[PDB]
Coordinates of C-alpha atoms and ligand atoms in Angstrom, one line a residue:
Chain A
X1 CA 12.4 -9.2 25.1
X2 CA 13.7 -11.9 27.6
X3 CA 10.1 -11.6 29.1
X4 CA 8.5 -12.5 25.8
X5 CA 7.8 -16.1 27.0
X6 CA 6.0 -15.1 30.1
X7 CA 2.2 -14.5 30.5
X8 CA 1.0 -10.9 30.8
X9 CA -0.7 -11.7 34.1
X10 CA 2.3 -13.5 35.5
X11 CA 4.5 -10.4 34.6
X12 CA 2.1 -8.0 36.4
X13 CA 1.9 -10.4 39.5
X14 CA 5.7 -10.5 39.6
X15 CA 6.1 -6.8 39.3
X16 CA 3.8 -6.6 42.4
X17 CA 6.1 -9.1 44.1
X18 CA 9.3 -7.3 43.1
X19 CA 7.9 -4.0 44.6
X20 CA 7.2 -5.7 47.9
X21 CA 10.8 -7.1 47.9
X22 CA 12.3 -3.7 46.8
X23 CA 13.7 -5.4 43.7
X24 CA 13.1 -2.4 41.5
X25 CA 15.3 -3.5 38.6
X26 CA 13.3 -6.8 38.5
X27 CA 10.1 -4.8 38.7
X28 CA 11.0 -2.5 35.8
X29 CA 12.0 -5.6 33.7
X30 CA 8.6 -7.3 34.5
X31 CA 6.7 -4.1 33.5
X32 CA 8.6 -3.6 30.2
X33 CA 7.7 -7.2 29.4
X34 CA 4.0 -6.4 30.2
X35 CA 4.0 -3.2 28.1
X36 CA 5.5 -5.1 25.2
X37 CA 2.6 -7.5 25.1
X38 CA 0.8 -4.6 23.3
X39 CA -2.3 -4.3 25.5
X40 CA -3.7 -1.4 27.6
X41 CA -2.2 -0.7 31.0
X42 CA -4.7 -0.1 33.6
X43 CA -4.3 2.8 36.2
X44 CA -2.7 0.3 38.6
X45 CA -0.4 -1.1 36.0
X46 CA 0.6 2.5 34.8
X47 CA 1.6 3.3 38.4
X48 CA 3.5 0.0 38.7
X49 CA 5.5 1.0 35.5
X50 CA 6.1 4.6 36.8
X51 CA 7.2 3.4 40.3
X52 CA 9.6 0.7 38.9
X53 CA 11.5 3.1 36.6
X54 CA 11.4 6.0 39.0
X55 CA 13.3 3.9 41.5
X56 CA 15.8 2.6 39.0
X57 CA 16.6 6.0 37.5
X58 CA 16.4 7.6 41.0
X59 CA 19.3 5.5 42.0
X60 CA 21.2 6.3 39.0
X61 CA 20.7 10.0 39.3
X62 CA 21.7 10.0 43.0
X63 CA 25.0 8.2 41.9
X64 CA 25.6 10.5 39.1
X65 CA 25.2 13.5 41.3
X66 CA 27.8 12.2 43.8
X67 CA 30.2 11.4 41.1
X68 CA 29.7 14.6 39.2
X69 CA 30.4 16.6 42.5
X70 CA 33.6 14.5 43.1
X71 CA 34.7 15.1 39.4
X72 CA 34.1 18.9 39.8
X73 CA 36.2 19.3 43.0
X74 CA 39.0 17.3 41.2
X75 CA 39.1 20.3 38.7
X83 CA 43.8 10.4 36.9
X84 CA 40.9 9.5 34.5
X85 CA 39.0 7.3 37.0
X86 CA 36.3 9.7 38.4
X87 CA 35.4 10.9 34.8
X88 CA 35.4 7.3 33.5
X89 CA 33.1 6.1 36.3
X90 CA 30.8 9.0 36.1
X91 CA 30.6 8.4 32.2
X92 CA 29.8 4.8 33.0
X93 CA 26.8 5.7 35.2
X94 CA 25.7 8.4 32.8
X95 CA 25.6 5.9 29.9
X96 CA 23.6 3.4 32.0
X97 CA 21.2 6.2 33.1
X98 CA 20.8 7.5 29.5
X99 CA 20.0 3.8 28.5
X100 CA 17.3 3.5 31.0
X101 CA 15.7 6.8 29.9
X102 CA 15.9 5.8 26.2
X103 CA 14.2 2.4 27.1
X104 CA 11.3 4.2 28.8
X105 CA 11.0 6.8 25.9
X106 CA 11.0 3.7 23.5
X107 CA 8.0 2.1 25.3
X108 CA 6.1 5.4 25.3
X109 CA 6.8 6.1 21.6
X110 CA 6.2 2.5 20.5
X111 CA 3.3 2.4 21.3
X112 CA 2.0 3.5 24.7
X113 CA 1.1 7.1 23.8
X114 CA -0.5 6.5 20.4
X115 CA -2.5 3.6 21.8
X116 CA -3.7 5.6 24.8
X117 CA -7.4 6.0 23.8
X118 CA -8.5 8.4 26.5
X119 CA -7.2 11.5 28.4
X120 CA -6.4 9.8 31.6
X121 CA -3.9 7.5 30.0
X122 CA -2.5 9.9 27.4
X123 CA -1.8 12.6 30.1
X124 CA -0.1 9.9 32.3
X125 CA 2.2 8.8 29.4
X126 CA 2.9 12.3 28.3
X127 CA 3.9 13.3 31.7
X128 CA 6.2 10.4 31.8
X129 CA 7.7 11.4 28.5
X130 CA 8.5 14.9 29.9
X131 CA 10.1 13.3 33.0
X132 CA 12.4 11.0 31.2
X133 CA 13.6 13.8 28.8
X134 CA 14.1 16.0 31.9
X135 CA 16.4 13.2 33.4
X136 CA 18.3 13.1 30.0
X137 CA 18.6 16.8 30.2
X138 CA 20.1 16.8 33.8
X139 CA 23.1 15.1 32.4
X140 CA 23.3 16.4 28.8
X141 CA 25.6 19.1 27.5
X144 CA 22.0 18.7 22.4
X145 CA 20.9 19.5 25.8
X146 CA 19.0 22.3 23.9
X147 CA 17.1 19.7 21.9
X148 CA 16.2 17.5 24.9
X149 CA 14.9 20.5 26.9
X150 CA 12.6 21.4 24.0
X151 CA 11.4 17.7 23.8
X152 CA 10.7 17.7 27.6
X153 CA 8.8 21.1 27.5
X154 CA 6.7 20.0 24.4
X155 CA 5.6 16.8 26.1
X156 CA 4.7 18.4 29.5
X157 CA 2.9 21.2 27.7
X158 CA 0.8 18.9 25.7
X159 CA -0.1 16.9 28.8
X160 CA -1.0 20.2 30.6
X161 CA -3.3 21.3 27.7
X162 CA -5.1 17.9 27.9
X163 CA -5.3 17.8 31.7
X164 CA -6.7 21.3 31.9
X165 CA -9.5 20.3 29.5
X166 CA -10.3 16.9 30.7
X167 CA -9.4 16.6 34.5
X168 CA -10.4 18.5 37.5
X169 CA -7.8 20.7 39.2
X170 CA -7.4 18.3 42.1
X171 CA -6.8 15.2 40.1
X172 CA -3.5 13.7 41.4
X173 CA -2.0 12.9 37.9
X174 CA -2.7 16.5 36.8
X175 CA -1.2 17.8 40.1
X176 CA 1.9 15.6 39.8
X177 CA 2.2 16.7 36.1
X178 CA 2.2 20.4 37.1
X179 CA 4.6 19.8 40.0
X180 CA 7.2 18.1 37.7
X181 CA 6.7 20.6 34.9
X182 CA 7.4 23.4 37.6
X183 CA 10.6 21.5 38.6
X184 CA 11.5 21.4 35.0
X185 CA 11.2 25.2 34.7
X186 CA 13.0 25.9 37.7
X187 CA 16.0 23.4 37.6
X188 CA 16.5 22.7 33.8
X189 CA 15.1 25.5 31.8
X190 CA 16.3 28.5 33.8
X191 CA 12.8 29.7 34.1
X192 CA 12.2 30.3 37.8
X193 CA 9.3 32.8 37.3
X194 CA 7.4 30.2 35.2
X195 CA 8.1 27.5 37.9
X196 CA 6.6 29.9 40.6
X197 CA 3.7 30.9 38.5
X198 CA 2.8 27.3 37.6
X199 CA 3.2 26.0 41.1
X200 CA 1.1 28.8 42.7
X201 CA -1.7 28.7 40.2
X202 CA -1.8 24.9 40.5
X203 CA -1.8 25.0 44.4
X204 CA -4.5 27.7 44.5
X205 CA -6.8 26.0 41.9
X206 CA -6.4 22.7 43.8
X207 CA -7.3 24.4 47.1
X208 CA -10.5 25.9 45.7
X209 CA -11.7 22.6 44.5
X210 CA -11.0 20.5 47.7
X211 CA -14.5 21.1 48.7
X212 CA -15.7 18.7 46.1
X213 CA -13.8 15.6 47.4
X214 CA -14.2 12.7 49.6
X215 CA -11.9 12.0 52.5
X216 CA -9.8 9.7 50.5
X217 CA -9.4 11.9 47.3
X218 CA -8.8 14.9 49.7
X219 CA -5.7 12.9 51.0
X220 CA -4.4 12.2 47.5
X221 CA -4.7 15.8 46.5
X222 CA -3.2 17.4 49.6
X223 CA -0.2 15.1 49.5
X224 CA 0.9 16.7 46.2
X225 CA -0.2 20.0 47.4
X226 CA 2.4 19.6 50.0
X227 CA 5.2 19.2 47.5
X228 CA 4.0 22.4 45.6
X229 CA 4.1 24.3 49.0
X230 CA 7.6 23.0 49.8
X231 CA 9.0 24.2 46.5
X232 CA 7.2 27.6 46.6
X233 CA 8.8 28.0 50.1
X234 CA 12.2 27.4 48.7
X235 CA 11.8 29.5 45.5
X236 CA 10.2 32.6 47.2
Chain B
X4 CA 17.2 21.0 45.2
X5 CA 13.5 21.2 44.1
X6 CA 11.2 18.3 45.0
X7 CA 9.3 16.3 42.1
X8 CA 6.5 13.9 42.6
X9 CA 7.4 11.5 45.3
Chain C
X1 CA 36.9 -11.2 34.3
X2 CA 35.5 -8.2 32.6
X3 CA 37.7 -6.3 34.9
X4 CA 40.9 -7.9 33.7
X5 CA 41.9 -4.8 31.5
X6 CA 41.7 -2.4 34.4
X7 CA 44.8 -1.5 36.5
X8 CA 44.4 -2.8 40.1
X9 CA 44.8 0.9 41.4
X10 CA 42.0 2.0 39.3
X11 CA 39.7 -0.8 40.4
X12 CA 40.4 0.1 44.1
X13 CA 39.8 3.8 43.4
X14 CA 36.5 3.0 41.5
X15 CA 35.4 0.7 44.4
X16 CA 35.7 3.7 46.7
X17 CA 33.8 5.9 44.3
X18 CA 31.1 3.2 43.9
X19 CA 30.6 3.1 47.7
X20 CA 30.2 6.8 48.0
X21 CA 27.6 6.5 45.2
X22 CA 25.9 3.6 47.0
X23 CA 26.5 1.5 43.8
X24 CA 27.3 -1.6 45.6
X25 CA 26.9 -4.1 42.7
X26 CA 29.5 -2.0 40.9
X27 CA 31.6 -1.8 44.0
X28 CA 31.6 -5.7 44.4
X29 CA 32.6 -6.1 40.7
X30 CA 35.5 -3.6 41.1
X31 CA 36.7 -5.4 44.2
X32 CA 36.3 -9.0 42.5
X33 CA 38.6 -7.5 39.7
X34 CA 41.0 -6.4 42.3
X35 CA 41.1 -9.7 44.1
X36 CA 41.8 -11.5 40.7
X37 CA 44.9 -9.5 40.1
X38 CA 46.4 -12.0 42.7
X39 CA 48.1 -9.6 45.1
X40 CA 47.5 -9.0 48.8
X41 CA 44.4 -7.0 49.9
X42 CA 45.3 -4.4 52.6
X43 CA 43.1 -3.9 55.6
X44 CA 41.2 -1.2 53.9
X45 CA 40.8 -3.3 50.7
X46 CA 39.5 -6.2 52.8
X47 CA 36.9 -3.9 54.4
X48 CA 36.0 -2.7 50.8
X49 CA 35.4 -6.2 49.6
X50 CA 33.4 -7.1 52.6
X51 CA 31.2 -4.0 52.5
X52 CA 30.5 -4.4 48.9
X53 CA 29.4 -8.1 48.9
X54 CA 27.6 -7.6 52.3
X55 CA 25.4 -5.0 50.7
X56 CA 24.7 -6.9 47.6
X57 CA 23.8 -10.1 49.4
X58 CA 22.0 -8.2 52.0
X59 CA 19.4 -6.8 49.5
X60 CA 19.0 -10.3 48.1
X61 CA 18.4 -11.8 51.6
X62 CA 15.9 -9.2 52.4
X63 CA 14.1 -9.8 49.3
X64 CA 14.1 -13.6 49.7
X65 CA 12.7 -13.2 53.1
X66 CA 9.8 -11.2 51.7
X67 CA 9.1 -13.6 49.1
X68 CA 9.4 -16.7 51.2
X69 CA 6.9 -15.2 53.7
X70 CA 4.4 -14.6 50.9
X71 CA 4.9 -18.0 49.6
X72 CA 4.4 -19.6 53.1
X73 CA 1.0 -17.7 53.4
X74 CA -0.1 -18.9 50.0
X75 CA 0.3 -22.3 51.5
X83 CA -0.4 -20.1 40.5
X84 CA 3.4 -20.7 40.3
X85 CA 4.4 -17.1 40.3
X86 CA 5.5 -16.5 43.9
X87 CA 7.6 -19.8 44.0
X88 CA 9.1 -19.1 40.6
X89 CA 10.2 -15.5 41.6
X90 CA 11.5 -16.7 45.0
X91 CA 13.6 -19.2 43.2
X92 CA 14.9 -16.7 40.9
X93 CA 16.1 -14.5 43.7
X94 CA 17.4 -17.5 45.6
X95 CA 19.4 -18.6 42.6
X96 CA 20.8 -15.1 42.2
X97 CA 21.7 -15.1 46.0
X98 CA 23.5 -18.5 45.7
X99 CA 25.4 -17.3 42.8
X100 CA 26.8 -14.3 44.7
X101 CA 27.7 -16.5 47.6
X102 CA 29.4 -19.1 45.3
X103 CA 31.3 -16.2 43.7
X104 CA 32.6 -14.8 47.1
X105 CA 33.5 -18.4 48.4
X106 CA 35.4 -19.0 45.1
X107 CA 37.6 -15.9 45.6
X108 CA 38.2 -17.0 49.2
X109 CA 39.2 -20.5 48.0
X110 CA 41.1 -19.3 44.9
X111 CA 43.3 -18.0 46.5
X112 CA 42.7 -15.4 49.2
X113 CA 42.8 -17.8 52.2
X114 CA 45.8 -19.7 51.1
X115 CA 47.8 -16.6 50.3
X116 CA 46.8 -14.9 53.6
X117 CA 50.3 -14.9 55.1
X118 CA 49.4 -13.6 58.6
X119 CA 46.8 -14.1 61.3
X120 CA 45.0 -10.8 60.7
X121 CA 44.3 -11.6 57.1
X122 CA 43.5 -15.2 57.4
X123 CA 41.0 -14.6 60.2
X124 CA 39.3 -12.0 58.1
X125 CA 38.9 -14.3 55.3
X126 CA 37.7 -17.3 57.3
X127 CA 35.2 -15.1 59.0
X128 CA 33.9 -14.2 55.5
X129 CA 33.8 -18.0 54.5
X130 CA 31.7 -18.6 57.6
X131 CA 29.4 -15.7 56.6
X132 CA 28.7 -16.8 53.1
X133 CA 28.3 -20.4 53.9
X134 CA 25.8 -19.1 56.6
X135 CA 23.9 -17.2 53.9
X136 CA 23.7 -20.2 51.8
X137 CA 22.3 -22.1 54.8
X138 CA 19.5 -19.7 55.2
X139 CA 18.0 -20.8 52.0
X140 CA 19.2 -24.4 51.8
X141 CA 17.1 -27.6 52.5
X144 CA 22.5 -30.5 51.7
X145 CA 21.7 -27.8 54.3
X146 CA 23.5 -30.1 56.6
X147 CA 26.7 -30.1 54.7
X148 CA 26.7 -26.3 54.3
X149 CA 26.0 -25.8 58.1
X150 CA 29.1 -28.0 58.9
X151 CA 31.2 -26.0 56.4
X152 CA 30.2 -22.6 58.1
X153 CA 30.8 -23.9 61.6
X154 CA 34.3 -25.2 60.6
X155 CA 35.4 -21.9 58.9
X156 CA 34.1 -19.9 61.9
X157 CA 35.8 -22.2 64.4
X158 CA 39.2 -22.1 62.7
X159 CA 38.9 -18.3 62.6
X160 CA 38.1 -18.3 66.3
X161 CA 41.0 -20.6 67.1
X162 CA 43.5 -18.3 65.3
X163 CA 42.0 -15.2 66.6
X164 CA 42.1 -16.3 70.2
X165 CA 45.8 -17.0 69.9
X166 CA 46.8 -14.0 67.8
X167 CA 44.5 -11.0 68.5
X168 CA 43.5 -9.3 71.8
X169 CA 39.9 -9.7 73.0
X170 CA 39.0 -6.2 71.9
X171 CA 40.2 -6.6 68.2
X172 CA 37.1 -5.5 66.1
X173 CA 37.7 -8.4 63.6
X174 CA 37.8 -10.9 66.4
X175 CA 34.7 -9.3 67.8
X176 CA 32.8 -9.3 64.7
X177 CA 33.7 -12.9 64.0
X178 CA 32.4 -14.0 67.5
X179 CA 29.3 -12.0 67.1
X180 CA 28.5 -13.5 63.6
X181 CA 29.4 -17.1 64.9
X182 CA 27.0 -16.6 67.8
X183 CA 24.3 -15.6 65.2
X184 CA 25.1 -18.7 63.3
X185 CA 24.6 -20.9 66.4
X186 CA 21.2 -19.2 67.3
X187 CA 19.7 -18.7 63.9
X188 CA 21.1 -21.6 61.8
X189 CA 22.5 -24.5 64.0
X190 CA 19.7 -24.8 66.6
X191 CA 22.2 -24.0 69.3
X192 CA 20.9 -21.1 71.2
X193 CA 22.9 -22.0 74.4
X194 CA 26.1 -21.9 72.4
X195 CA 25.1 -18.6 71.0
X196 CA 24.5 -17.2 74.5
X197 CA 27.7 -18.7 75.8
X198 CA 29.8 -17.3 73.0
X199 CA 28.2 -13.9 73.0
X200 CA 28.5 -13.4 76.8
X201 CA 32.2 -14.6 77.1
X202 CA 33.2 -12.5 74.1
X203 CA 31.4 -9.5 75.6
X204 CA 32.9 -10.0 79.1
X205 CA 36.4 -10.5 77.9
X206 CA 36.2 -7.5 75.7
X207 CA 35.0 -5.3 78.6
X208 CA 37.8 -6.4 80.8
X209 CA 40.3 -5.3 78.2
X210 CA 38.9 -1.9 77.3
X211 CA 41.3 -0.3 79.8
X212 CA 44.2 -1.0 77.4
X213 CA 42.7 0.9 74.5
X214 CA 42.9 4.5 73.1
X215 CA 39.8 6.6 72.7
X216 CA 39.5 5.6 68.9
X217 CA 40.0 1.8 69.5
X218 CA 37.6 2.0 72.4
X219 CA 34.9 3.4 70.0
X220 CA 35.7 0.5 67.6
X221 CA 35.3 -2.2 70.2
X222 CA 32.2 -0.8 72.1
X223 CA 30.3 -0.5 68.9
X224 CA 30.5 -4.3 68.3
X225 CA 29.9 -5.0 72.0
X226 CA 26.7 -3.1 71.6
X227 CA 25.5 -5.7 69.1
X228 CA 26.6 -8.5 71.3
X229 CA 24.4 -6.7 74.2
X230 CA 21.5 -6.5 71.8
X231 CA 21.4 -10.2 71.0
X232 CA 21.9 -11.2 74.6
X233 CA 18.9 -9.1 75.5
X234 CA 16.9 -10.8 73.0
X235 CA 18.1 -14.2 73.8
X236 CA 17.9 -14.2 77.5
Chain D
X4 CA 15.9 -11.6 64.1
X5 CA 19.4 -11.7 65.7
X6 CA 21.8 -9.0 64.7
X7 CA 25.0 -9.7 62.8
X8 CA 27.9 -7.4 62.3
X9 CA 26.6 -4.1 60.9
Ligands
0AW1 N1 1.6 -0.7 43.5 C1 1.7 0.7 43.6 N2 2.8 1.3 43.9 C2 0.4 1.5 43.3 C3 -0.7 0.8 43.0 C4 -1.9 1.9 42.8 C5 -3.2 1.6 42.3 C6 -3.8 0.4 42.9 C7 -5.1 0.0 42.6 C8 -5.9 0.8 41.6 C9 -5.3 2.0 41.2 C10 -3.9 2.3 41.5 C11 -1.3 3.2 43.0 C12 -2.0 4.5 42.9 N3 -1.0 5.5 43.1 C13 -0.7 6.1 44.5 O1 -1.4 5.8 45.3 C14 0.3 7.1 44.6 C15 0.3 7.9 45.6 C16 1.3 9.0 45.8 C17 2.3 9.0 44.6 C18 2.2 8.2 43.6 C19 1.2 7.2 43.5 C20 3.4 8.6 42.8 C21 4.3 9.4 43.7 O2 3.4 10.0 44.6 S1 0.3 3.1 43.4
0AW2 N1 -9.7 9.9 39.0 C1 -9.1 9.7 40.0 N2 -8.9 11.0 41.0 C2 -8.4 8.5 40.4 C3 -8.9 7.3 39.9 C4 -8.1 6.1 40.4 C5 -8.5 4.7 40.2 C6 -8.7 4.3 38.8 C7 -9.0 3.0 38.4 C8 -9.1 2.0 39.5 C9 -8.9 2.4 40.8 C10 -8.6 3.8 41.2 C11 -7.0 6.7 41.2 C12 -6.0 5.7 41.8 N3 -5.0 6.7 42.4 C13 -3.9 7.0 41.7 O1 -3.6 6.5 40.6 C14 -2.9 8.0 42.3 C15 -3.2 8.5 43.5 C16 -2.4 9.4 44.2 C17 -1.3 9.9 43.4 C18 -1.1 9.5 42.1 C19 -1.9 8.4 41.5 C20 0.3 10.1 41.5 C21 0.4 11.3 42.5 O2 -0.3 11.0 43.8 S1 -7.1 8.3 41.4
0AW3 N1 6.9 35.7 43.5 C1 5.7 35.3 44.3 N2 4.8 34.8 43.7 C2 5.6 35.5 45.8 C3 6.1 36.7 46.5 C4 5.9 36.4 47.9 C5 6.3 37.5 48.9 C6 5.9 38.9 48.6 C7 6.2 40.0 49.4 C8 6.9 39.7 50.7 C9 7.4 38.2 50.9 C10 7.0 37.3 50.1 C11 5.1 35.2 48.1 C12 4.7 34.8 49.5 N3 4.8 33.3 49.6 C13 3.5 32.7 49.2 O1 2.7 33.4 48.7 C14 3.2 31.2 49.2 C15 2.1 31.3 48.6 C16 1.3 30.2 48.2 C17 1.8 29.1 48.6 C18 3.0 29.0 49.2 C19 3.8 30.0 49.6 C20 3.0 27.4 49.3 C21 1.7 26.7 48.8 O2 1.0 27.9 48.4 S1 4.9 34.4 46.6
0AW4 N1 35.6 2.2 53.0 C1 35.2 1.5 54.1 N2 33.9 1.2 54.1 C2 36.1 1.3 55.1 C3 37.5 1.6 55.0 C4 38.2 1.2 56.4 C5 39.7 1.4 56.4 C6 40.2 2.6 55.9 C7 41.6 2.8 56.2 C8 42.4 2.0 56.7 C9 41.9 0.8 57.2 C10 40.6 0.5 57.1 C11 37.4 0.6 57.3 C12 37.6 0.1 58.6 N3 36.4 -0.6 58.9 C13 35.5 0.1 59.8 O1 35.7 1.1 60.1 C14 34.2 -0.5 60.1 C15 33.6 -0.2 61.3 C16 32.3 -0.8 61.7 C17 32.0 -1.9 61.1 C18 32.7 -2.4 59.9 C19 33.9 -1.7 59.5 C20 32.1 -3.6 59.3 C21 30.6 -3.5 59.9 O2 30.8 -2.8 61.1 S1 35.8 0.6 56.5
0AW5 N1 44.5 -3.8 64.9 C1 43.5 -3.1 65.0 N2 42.7 -3.1 66.2 C2 43.1 -2.4 63.7 C3 44.1 -1.9 62.8 C4 43.5 -1.3 61.7 C5 44.3 -0.6 60.4 C6 45.2 -1.5 59.9 C7 46.0 -1.0 58.8 C8 45.9 0.5 58.4 C9 45.0 1.2 59.2 C10 44.2 0.8 60.2 C11 42.1 -1.1 61.9 C12 41.2 -0.4 60.9 N3 39.8 -0.7 61.5 C13 39.0 -1.7 61.0 O1 39.5 -2.5 60.1 C14 37.8 -1.9 61.5 C15 37.3 -1.1 62.6 C16 36.1 -1.4 63.1 C17 35.3 -2.6 62.8 C18 35.9 -3.4 61.9 C19 37.1 -3.2 61.3 C20 34.9 -4.5 61.7 C21 34.0 -4.4 62.9 O2 34.2 -3.1 63.3 S1 41.7 -1.8 63.3
0AW6 N1 21.3 -17.8 80.1 C1 22.2 -16.8 80.7 N2 23.4 -16.7 80.6 C2 21.5 -15.6 81.4 C3 20.5 -15.8 82.4 C4 20.1 -14.4 82.9 C5 19.1 -14.3 83.9 C6 19.2 -15.1 85.1 C7 18.3 -14.9 86.1 C8 17.3 -14.1 86.0 C9 17.0 -13.3 84.9 C10 18.1 -13.3 83.8 C11 21.0 -13.5 82.3 C12 20.8 -11.9 82.6 N3 21.2 -11.2 81.5 C13 22.6 -10.9 81.4 O1 23.3 -11.1 82.3 C14 23.2 -10.0 80.3 C15 24.5 -10.3 80.6 C16 25.5 -9.7 80.1 C17 25.3 -9.0 79.0 C18 24.1 -8.6 78.4 C19 22.9 -9.2 79.2 C20 24.5 -7.8 77.3 C21 25.9 -7.7 77.3 O2 26.5 -8.4 78.2 S1 22.0 -14.0 81.3
MG7 MG1 -5.7 1.5 23.5
MG8 MG1 50.4 -13.2 50.7

């Protein structure tokens, strides 16, 4: 790692600066360096890691979708070639994230909060691989298995309003609808998740209430599209 | 397209 | 150049795809490859080159401004170090563009339209260097000299509504106000440019009228701020 | 800040 010579605390500080500067590639590199130090990531640091790679892969996914749409309408080699270039770059980022999770974030995640967070990430980055795969079958199964393990732990160890649990269920429901050809599973998961969170809002402070209802909005938006 | 965590 | 093995036509096509995909770093790399083939850039291709590098350096400038503001308020080494990293990357992009212009876009620009376009670019990229310089004196003089040569040619060879001429005068006026501590020069240039364009709108088609009045809006916005 | 060509 080219970040191996930098102190962990300096990598975290620079990741926070990169976020403020909207330099998400730098942010991701700094957070990869921090992970590779081999110590726990705190809740804040896990959020930094996730935000950084979500923004990097998000731009790649948006580009890939533009190019894939152009390639489809065209049906010279240039559109295919450039789509393949972006696709390879996207796969490389996903492989990098999955490698951090497998060596050794997940096994070293010594409580439910941290293990669920990383297993949700594992589902997400296999899902992004599935979006461009054609082999696609294996990736889909890996994403479902990671999401489901995360769900099982989260249902045992977190309340139904916990925002990590809510965002996990939201993204698993998107997986079912958009990737796995399981729209009924998507609807069932989003609806039960929404309803069980609603019935638990009375237990929350004003600030936690805001956290939970933000994700609940996204569940509602999908259910409105899907039904 | 469906909306993921954002 | 890593683009030396790609056909010129394929580089131009991929630059257009990269623009649609909002992949501006890729777009700039493709257009650098096309320039280095050693042939003319058409009006469309000059616009592609300019859009690509404007977006790349634009993100760098925005990041540098965020970090410089944080560094100023702080007055460990981390903010300075990271600001310096972004600054060096920004200078490298500007040096790359200035190198394309000097070897050999400007000398090979065999008419006024193309020479003015490239000299405007030369002023712009020296101006971006000046924003981060402290030596700053030399850069300021280089920017002013390029802009002024472009102005002299444009006044002799283009009508007052030509959008390249208008955008040149706009950016030279920003140079005067923000870089050269010459706010009166900025006001004088923006006002004469606006007034002379206005008096020439009657000569234009609906489409050229739209081109010119768009830049005239930016002249107006600055004059409203400056007076 | 002043506005350049955009
Ligand atoms: N520097 C950052 N970006 C963050 C820092 C922290 C933090 C700070 C101190 C202590 C613990 C955590 C965050 C907490 N996470 C959110 O607030 C959040 C809200 C909505 C949402 C997401 C995240 C994901 C998409 O939808 S984010
Ligand atoms: N046990 C809880 N309920 C929380 C505990 C903490 C925490 C832990 C240690 C230190 C400081 C704060 C939270 C911080 N908040 C988030 O991480 C967060 C918020 C909104 C959100 C997401 C994440 C993703 C989707 O939207 S939440
Ligand atoms: N296949 C299903 N399960 C559904 C079928 C219908 C339906 C039935 C008969 C007539 C018209 C529609 C549903 C109605 N829509 C919702 O109930 C809805 C519910 C909860 C919710 C949101 C939207 C957002 C957040 O929480 S849902
Ligand atoms: N692919 C692109 N991006 C472009 C392609 C062409 C083109 C196409 C065919 C023939 C000739 C030129 C453009 C012409 N230039 C503008 O229309 C323009 C308008 C406003 C403005 C700027 C530029 C700079 C900032 O303010 S841009
Ligand atoms: N002689 C003229 N008036 C023009 C001729 C052409 C052209 C030349 C060859 C082929 C097709 C078209 C133009 C294309 N348009 C631009 O390049 C353009 C438009 C708006 C704008 C900028 C640039 C920068 C600021 O805002 S303009
Ligand atoms: N130092 C100068 N030159 C100016 C001084 C004053 C002034 C004088 C007395 C009282 C109040 C203001 C000016 C008024 N503002 C404009 O005239 C203005 C003109 C043209 C124009 C735009 C704005 C936008 C596009 O074109 S300009
Ligand atoms: Mg541990
Ligand atoms: Mg020539």
